[PDB]
Amino acid sequence: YSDELRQRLAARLEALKENG
């Protein structure tokens, strides 16, 4: 995966968890 690419996937999760 390499460190950076994983954190990118986290950034998506972040947007979704805002509301609910």
Swiss-Prot record:
Note the segments forming the sequence repeats. 1-20
- Consequence of substituting R8C: In Milano; correlated with decreased HDL levels and moderate increase in triglycerides; allows the formation of disulfide-linked homodimers via the introduced cysteine; assembles properly in HDL; alters protein structure; has no tendency to form fibrils and aggregates
Record's subunit section: Homodimer. Interacts with NAXE and CLU. Component of a sperm activating protein complex (SPAP), consisting of APOA1, an immunoglobulin heavy chain, an immunoglobulin light chain and albumin. Interacts with NDRG1. Interacts with SCGB3A2. Interacts with NAXE and YJEFN3.
Q: What is this protein called?
A: Apolipoprotein A-I
Whole-protein residues included: 190 to 209 of 267
Tissue expression as described in the entry: Major protein of plasma HDL, also found in chylomicrons. Synthesized in the liver and small intestine. It is also present in increased levels in aortic lesions relative to native ApoA-I and increased levels are seen with increasing severity of disease.
- Cellular compartment(s): Secreted
Q: Which disease is it linked to?
A: Hypoalphalipoproteinemia, primary, 2: An autosomal recessive disorder of lipoprotein metabolism, biochemically characterized by severe apoA-I deficiency and severely reduced serum high-density lipoprotein cholesterol (HDL-C). Affected individuals have undetectable serum levels of apoA-I, and develop xanthomas and corneal opacities. The disease is generally associated with atherosclerosis and markedly increased cardiovascular risk.
What does the protein in this record do?
Participates in the reverse transport of cholesterol from tissues to the liver for excretion by promoting cholesterol efflux from tissues and by acting as a cofactor for the lecithin cholesterol acyltransferase (LCAT). As part of the SPAP complex, activates spermatozoa motility.
PTM annotation, UniProt: Glycosylated. Palmitoylated.
